[PDB]
Amino acid sequence: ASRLYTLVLVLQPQRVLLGMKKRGFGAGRWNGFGGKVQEGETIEDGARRELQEESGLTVDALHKVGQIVFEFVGEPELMDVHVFCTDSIQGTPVESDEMRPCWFQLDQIPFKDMWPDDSYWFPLLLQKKKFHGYFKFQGQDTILDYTLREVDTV
Amino acid sequence: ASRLYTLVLVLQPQRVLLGMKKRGFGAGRWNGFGGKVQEGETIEDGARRELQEESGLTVDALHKVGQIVFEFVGEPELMDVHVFCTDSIQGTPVESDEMRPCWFQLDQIPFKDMWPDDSYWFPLLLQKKKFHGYFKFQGQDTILDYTLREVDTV
Ligand SMILES: [Cl-]
Numbered sequence: 643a644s645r646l647y648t649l650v651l652v653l654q655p656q657r658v659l660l661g662m663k664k665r666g667f668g669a670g671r672w673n674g675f676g677g678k679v680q681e682g683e684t685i686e687d688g689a690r691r692e693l694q695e696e697s698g699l700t701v702d703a704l705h706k707v708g709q710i711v712f713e714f715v716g717e718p719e720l721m722d723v724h725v726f727c728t729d730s731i732q733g734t735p736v737e738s739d740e741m742r743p744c745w746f747q748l749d750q751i752p753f754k755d756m757w758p759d760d761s762y763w764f765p766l767l768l769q770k771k772k773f774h775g776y777f778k779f780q781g782q783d784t785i786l787d788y789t790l791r792e793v794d795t796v
Numbered sequence: 797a798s799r800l801y802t803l804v805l806v807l808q809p810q811r812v813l814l815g816m817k818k819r820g821f822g823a824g825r826w827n828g829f830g831g832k833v834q835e836g837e838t839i840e841d842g843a844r845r846e847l848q849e850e851s852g853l854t855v856d857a858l859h860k861v862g863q864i865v866f867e868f869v870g871e872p873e874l875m876d877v878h879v880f881c882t883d884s885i886q887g888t889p890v891e892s893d894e895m896r897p898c899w900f901q902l903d904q905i906p907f908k909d910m911w912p913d914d915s916y917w918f919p920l921l922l923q924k925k926k927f928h929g930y931f932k933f934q935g936q937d938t939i940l941d942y943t944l945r946e947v948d949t950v
Contacts, residue, residue, distance in 0.1 A: 778941075787932075787941045 644722040648689035649676040662742040698736025706796040798876040802843035803830040816896040852890025860950040
């Protein structure tokens with residue numbers, strides 16, 4: 643019923659890395675880095691792979707910070723998104739044909755040009771709180787219903 | 797935007813009192829006792845009044861146990877239901893033209909003939925947990941969406 647995805651936020655003391663998607667699903671929005679988890683690959687390894695593929699950064703330690711389930715009206719498959727954070731990275735962000743990474747000061751996170759669910763859970767991530775969320779969408783821009791709570795265990 | 801209601805459950809160690817509504821809103825279902833809160837009356841006093849009016853019982857102490865907000869699609873006014881419990885009552889339940897009270901053993905609560913939200917929050921009430929809930933209904937029988945959580949403070 644659900645498909646596994648990862649989402650990685652590089653969050654440092656005063657700034658966070660986001661990527662502008664240049665084409666495809668979510669073009670024109672800023673977001674974290676991630677994608678589908680592969681056959682035979684752990685969710686964490688998938689998260690590391692996708693951060694490295696999409697941003698050009700090398701990550702050692704990833705930390706589990708959340709789980710978000712997305713439901714899209716009209717679509718049978720739910721998205722089961724495992725959210726991770728890291729402070730410690732190597733390399734510098736790389737712009738590719740698919741993604742333009744940029745650093746944002748924490749007071750200047752571009753919520754109006756991010757997925758609408760981010761306005762709910764990002765503030766939790768910034769204060770190092772872990773969460774479980776569920777968002778029902780109609781299209782890409784409208785949240786019909788949601789739940790969100792803080793958790794001790796992701 | 798919301799209208800105040802009360803709902804009172806008489807919960808003793810091995811049994812709970814419910815009333816079968818004989819006519820009007822909710823006829824044919826078992827439920828707790830309550831109704832609208834009046835001008836100039838506290839919510840607790842409203843709860844005591846309605847228990848006494850509908851069941852014939854006299855209650856001294858009522859305990860706050862929950863808050864449930866109901867939304868009915870097509871209806872502008874939300875219902876803000878303040879839920880109370882008591883163990884200590886006086887008198888014996890009285891059947892009237894409006895209501896038939898009956899005691900139920902805790903393993904025989906008639907959930908299939910109660911409002912559907914009760915299946916979610918009643919088990920919390922039985923284990924002396926306090927809660928906040930929200931239920932979106934289409935008609936009387938269908939929960940479209942809900943949230944429910946345990947709270948320290950009602
Ligand atoms: Cl919900």
